[PDB]
Amino acid sequence: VEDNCINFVAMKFIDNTLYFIAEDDENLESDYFGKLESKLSVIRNLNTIFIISMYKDSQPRGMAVTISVKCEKISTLSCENKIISFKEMNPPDNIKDTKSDIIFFQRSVPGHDNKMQFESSSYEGYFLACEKERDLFKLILKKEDELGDRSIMFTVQNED
């Protein structure tokens, strides 16, 4: 069964915080008899930017990936000191130390084996995901193993 839960199209950051609107805004309910609790949300690239860049590791324990979002000056997502934060400026090309907030590891998902989740390099065992907040969606770190609230998993669509 192709269990799909689309919840992302495109949305910008507000107040130094990354916001994401969903495709549905009226909370329409399905007529299928069974429940449809969401488990992933992946789809994007619908035509406010969302940078992903790959890096090569001399110590390969996972493909190195970056996230950044365009600002007045480009901002990169950061994971310093066991908290979530957005740091500004651009990455210094190839990163020298492996332990950094710039680089992330991508792990394949059980769903269709076409998408990948994101893994912190500065944290070992933590997990980046999203949770329902008010009418929008807020990207907040939460452990994948622990079922925190609904625990919507954050994945991105790969190029064919």
Binding site: E2, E29, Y32
Partner: protein, 148 residues
Amino acid sequence: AEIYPIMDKSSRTRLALIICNEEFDSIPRRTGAEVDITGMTMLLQNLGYSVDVKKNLTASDMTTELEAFAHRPEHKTSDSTFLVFMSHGIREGICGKKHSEQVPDILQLNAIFNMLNTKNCPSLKDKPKVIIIQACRGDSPGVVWFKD
């Protein structure tokens, strides 16, 4: 002669059925069905139909209700019909009041067509059976992500 016969307004006695399922016994409720029933009934009443409204019917009772609708006399004096359905839907067909994943109680569309054919419903020969169904037919958002 490309249009259907339409009988006199002052003497015709049309008939339409509006079956909707809102409250179930093992399924989450179909909220908002009340406005649906009200709007559909008002529209058909404006169109010129004697609306019959039923709620929360098991498929077994559903079938005998269809048979009673077919056997009603107004059909000899009508020229069409409407069977608007509103319930949950499995790919097999329409979900009843007592439907469950353990034992299914599903009213197929083929059965609905059979209960209103010329043999079983001789009163509706050369008369349209404009069935309207609002239900699900599978587990898929209905969209796919292809790489343009």
